[PDB]
């Protein structure tokens, strides 16, 4: 019995279909396209880490841009919102800085007020009571 | 390219022809016939392969000593060379010792 490949056409079309949008001979020649489709798939897997990294970097720039309009720096906003137990991530703050400018200014005022409270507490030796917004809600 | 554009001609197989309906018959001739006959005696084919099994080298060696005097000169010369090559391959080449 002699066996020959009869469905070799279907084995090469499943790889060439991913290369139809390429440029040059690497969209129709199986030998050339297979080495490009594999690299395209490899870049697809490794770009999932970059997309998460790039989104956060984009959010930081947008948060920084809006903070400067209110005379604040990015470390001064994120750092002082943590001490108020306001757990808002960069995704929300970037959205708030774009679609809710009035709400973002309220957060900037809260962060600025909390920032000023820490400086006042740093000047004292603990005799004066803590700031109004410096109180922390305890959970048991 | 490389694949036909039309369907192959239809093939119909007679599952109840004379050969298939009577295939495997008398395979129990020895058990049910007081062991007068052996099922290996029902094998039809080369005289050097009836009721015998072996690898390629053993088949060539057995064929040469049974019908070697009846083979054609070209076929006999090819058989002798095949035995020489298989002898060298099996006894000198391989992964295991």
């Amino acid at each position: 019995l002699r066996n020959r490949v009869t469905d070799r056409y279907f084995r090469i079309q499943e790889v060439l279909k991913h290369a139809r949008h390429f440029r040059g001979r690497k969209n129709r020649c199986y030998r050339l396209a297979v080495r490009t489709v594999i690299r395209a798939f490899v870049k697809c897997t490794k770009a999932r880490y970059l997309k998460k990294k790039n989104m956060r970097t984009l959010w930081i720039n947008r948060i920084t841009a809006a903070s400067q309009e209110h005379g604040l720096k990015y470390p001064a906003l994120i750092g002082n919102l943590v001490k108020c137990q306001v757990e808002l991530n960069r995704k929300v703050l970037a959205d708030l800085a774009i679609y809710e400018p009035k709400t973002f200014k309220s957060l900037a005022a809260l962060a600025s007020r909390r920032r000023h409270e820490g400086f006042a507490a740093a000047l004292g030796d603990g005799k004066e009571p803590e700031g109004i917004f410096s109180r922390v809600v305890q959970y048991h | 390219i490389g694949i036909r554009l039309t369907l192959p001609p239809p093939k119909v197989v007679d599952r109840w022809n004379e050969k298939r309906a009577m295939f495997g018959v008398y395979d129990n001739i020895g058990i049910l016939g007081n062991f007068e006959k052996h099922p290996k005696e029902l094998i039809r084919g080369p005289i050097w392969l009836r009721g015998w099994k072996g690898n390629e080298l053993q088949r060539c060696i057995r064929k040469r000593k049974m019908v070697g005097s009846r083979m054609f000169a070209d076929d006999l010369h090819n058989l002798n060379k095949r035995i020489r090559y298989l002898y060298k391959h099996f006894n000198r080449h391989g992964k295991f010792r």
Binding site: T6, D7, Y9, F10 | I3, R4, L5, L7
Partner: peptide
């Protein structure tokens, strides 16, 4: 002429799909 039916049959379905693309039915 390679023997077999599955590959030839499968290719016909693919051709019909291309026919439905070049000349789509109303």
């Amino acid at each position: 002429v390679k023997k077999g039916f599955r590959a030839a049959f499968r290719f016909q379905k693919e051709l019909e799909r291309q026919r439905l693309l070049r000349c789509p039915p109303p």
